[PDB]
Design a protein around this ligand. Structure first.
Ligand SMILES: [Cu+]
Length: 73
């Protein structure tokens, strides 16, 4: 798996993001999800070989709000 992070957009409501975090946890690919928008950003160990950040990224956009952009690599 990869180790990208969706750097924080503007929100600081952990309750929003986690609502989607739980759903994203369904994607087998996702190795780990460390939502820390307040502390820095959401650091996520997406499986680029199974599912792309695009998925999760869009997902947290929907009802999470935090996804400025992916960094990592
Ligand atoms: Cu919220």
């Amino acid at each position: 798996m990869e180790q990208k992070t969706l750097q924080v957009e503007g929100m600081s409501c952990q309750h929003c993001v986690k609502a989607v975090e739980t759903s994203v946890g369904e994607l087998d690919g996702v190795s780990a999800v460390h939502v820390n928008l307040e502390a820095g950003k959401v650091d996520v160990s997406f499986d680029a070989d199974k599912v792309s950040v695009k998925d999760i990224a869009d997902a947290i956009e929907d009802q999470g709000y935090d996804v400025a952009k992916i960094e990592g690599r």
